[PDB]
Amino acid sequence: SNYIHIRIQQRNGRKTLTTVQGVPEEYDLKRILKVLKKDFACNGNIVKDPEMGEIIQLQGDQRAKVCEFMISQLGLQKKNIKIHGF
RNA sequence: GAAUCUGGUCAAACUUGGUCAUUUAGAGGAACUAAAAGUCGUAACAAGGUUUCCGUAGGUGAACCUGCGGAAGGAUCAUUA
Ligand SMILES: [Mg+2]
Ligand SMILES: [Mg+2]
Ligand SMILES: [Mg+2]
């Protein structure tokens, strides 16, 4: 019950994808994605993987930055958000 | 014929405003250049993998994309009768 986990999916070379799993569905997700895009400039998209819920995918190694953003805006704790690293 | 004195006249200056010029602190904001082992793509150069440009309008994360009209600086100097 509500534990946000951010992970890298390793792609070709140094280019990667960052998946945000278990996002709270309180604020508008598309809007959030747009904001993220505006911020650090990474091509964001929303994926619904076999009812895990709503997964935000971003380009590169936006993990720490994402966490910071969450802290600033919607995320309250630092604790229920875990950042993996693969 | 001195002080003094009535009007002028030239007129420095002074009080409060306004104005033009040049400076000058300047919370913040938006730039461009330089250095070009950061990040996201790959827009352009080959038909650059949707031919490029241009005017213009809209849209976007970012190169940009998409209308409408145009230009080869195009990948065509080419289909008689
Ligand atoms: Mg290209
Ligand atoms: Mg092209
Ligand atoms: Mg020229």
UniProtKB/Swiss-Prot annotation:
GO cellular component assignments: eukaryotic 43S preinitiation complex; multi-eIF complex
GO molecular function, one term: RNA binding
Keyword Coiled coil appears in the UniProt entry: no
GO biological process: formation of translation preinitiation complex; maintenance of translational fidelity; regulation of translation; regulation of translational fidelity
Superkingdom of origin: Eukaryota
The entry's keywords: Acetylation, Protein biosynthesis, Translation regulation
Assembly: The factors eIF-1, eIF-2, eIF-3, TIF5/eIF-5 and methionyl-tRNAi form a multifactor complex (MFC) that may bind to the 40S ribosome. Interacts with NIP1.
UniProt family annotation: Belongs to the SUI1 family.
Annotated function: Additional factor that functions in concert with eIF-2 and the initiator tRNA in directing the ribosome to the proper start site of translation.
Record's protein name: Eukaryotic translation initiation factor eIF-1
Originating gene: SUI1
Location of this fragment in the whole protein: 23 to 108 of 108
